[PDB]
Design a binder for this molecule. Structure first.
Ligand code: FMN
Length: 138
């Protein structure tokens, strides 16, 4: 599988590595990929797209890298299974509700409840690992 994310301070990055760990512990292979190094064509071969990005102002996806990537793949992902995750600060997850709605709007099947944790995983570590285990059971 493949996990692509954007992280400004490393919070979502940590979530991505814990998610990968859960998938690996379940017996599968995963590659974590920062949005800046992703290859669209190779990404579209996946059955499951695992996407993450922290909440930027105001309750939107990061603008200079992550969103342009989402807009680029938006027309080629109809029918694909998608799993969403991300870290946030002071909000209540609105950027994630909208992120899920957008993906559904593109024709994607959102496989699980999006995983959101406030700031660094830390206490939510097992939650990150478990979310990866749910995805590996798809
Ligand atoms: C410029 C900026 C805007 C932010 N806007 C929001 C916001 O609208 N809602 C929220 O809950 N957190 C917001 N945050 C907080 C980040 O989502 C949060 O600190 C998160 O833990 C960052 O994860 P990352 O290191 O993976 O980027 C903002 C952070 C920055 C730097």
């Amino acid at each position: 599988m493949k996990i692509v994310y954007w992280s400004g301070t490393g919070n979502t990055e940590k979530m991505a590595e814990l998610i990968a760990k859960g998938i690996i512990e379940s017996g599968k292979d995963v590659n974590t990929i920062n949005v800046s190094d992703v290859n669209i064509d190779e990404l579209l071969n996946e059955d499951i797209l695992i996407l993450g990005c922290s909440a930027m102002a105001d309750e939107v996806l990061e603008e200079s890298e992550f969103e342009p990537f989402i807009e680029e793949i938006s027309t080629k992902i109809s029918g694909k299974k998608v799993a969403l995750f991300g870290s946030y600060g002071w909000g209540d997850g609105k950027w994630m509700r909208d992120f899920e709605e957008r993906m559904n709007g593109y024709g994607c099947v959102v496989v699980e409840t999006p995983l959101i944790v406030q700031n660094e995983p830390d206490e939510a570590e097992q939650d990150c690992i478990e979310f990866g285990k749910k995805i590996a059971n798809i």
